[PDB]
Structure 1
Amino acid sequence: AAQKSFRIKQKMAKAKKQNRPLPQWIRLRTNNTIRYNAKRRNWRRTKMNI
Structure 2
Amino acid sequence: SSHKTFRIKRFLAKKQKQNRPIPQWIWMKTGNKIRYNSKRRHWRRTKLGL
TM-score, with length taken from structure 2: 0.94
Root-mean-square deviation (CA, aligned residues, Å) is 0.6
Q: 4+ runs of 1 displaced by more than 3 Å? A: none
In the alignment, residue 33 of structure 2 is paired with which amino acid?
T
- Give the length in aligned residue pairs: 50
Structure 2 residues not aligned, in runs of 5+: none
Q: Trace 1:1-12 onto structure 2 (pairs within 5 A).
A: 1-12=1-12
Structure 1 residues not aligned, in runs of 5+: none
In the alignment, residue 40 of structure 1 is paired with which amino acid?
R
Question: Percent identity over the alignment?
Answer: 60
Q: Name the structure, 1 or 2, with higher relative contact order (CA <8 Å, separation 6+).
A: 1
Task: Tell me what 1:44 maps to.
Answer: 44
TM-score, with length taken from structure 1: 0.94
Answer yes or no: is 1:20 the counterpart of 2:35. Answer: no
